[PDB]
Ligand binder design. Structure first.
Ligand SMILES: [Ca+2]
Length: 119
């Protein structure tokens, strides 16, 4: 199993939408269970502290095991800016595929900065 976010960007302003282009493949012998995108606040040990707006752009049965999709992912306008997080904490855009009913996973989790471009 594999998954890539093909059009990465480093930052986003809360309230904006990221137009994700995502390639995934469940892998030979596997069946896609879902593809999920969720914004996470992490600590310095890469342990999740908060999860925001969990989405499942691929889900259900009869989905293609491998495809490239476009998916608009929104950051709520009131999620705290990166500069206002506790020391060492950061945002990670979790982008991942589950195969075989959560039997195995792969990810293209990508660090992102939430900032206010007016400031
Ligand atoms: Ca990666």
């Amino acid at each position: 199993q594999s998954i890539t976010w093909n059009n990465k960007q480093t930052d986003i302003q809360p309230g904006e939408t990221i137009p994700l282009n995502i390639t995934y493949d469940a892998g030979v012998g596997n069946t896609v269970y879902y593809v999920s995108v969720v914004l996470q606040e992490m600590n310095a040990s890469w342990q999740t502290q908060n999860n925001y707006n969990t989405t499942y752009p691929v889900s259900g049965s009869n989905q293609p095991n491998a495809s490239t999709i476009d998916f608009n992912y929104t950051i709520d306008s009131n999620i705290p800016l990166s500069e206002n997080l506790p020391s060492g904490n950061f945002y990670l855009l979790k982008i991942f595929i589950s195969v075989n009913t959560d039997g195995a996973f792969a990810n293209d989790n990508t660090q992102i900065t939430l900032l206010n471009n007016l400031e």
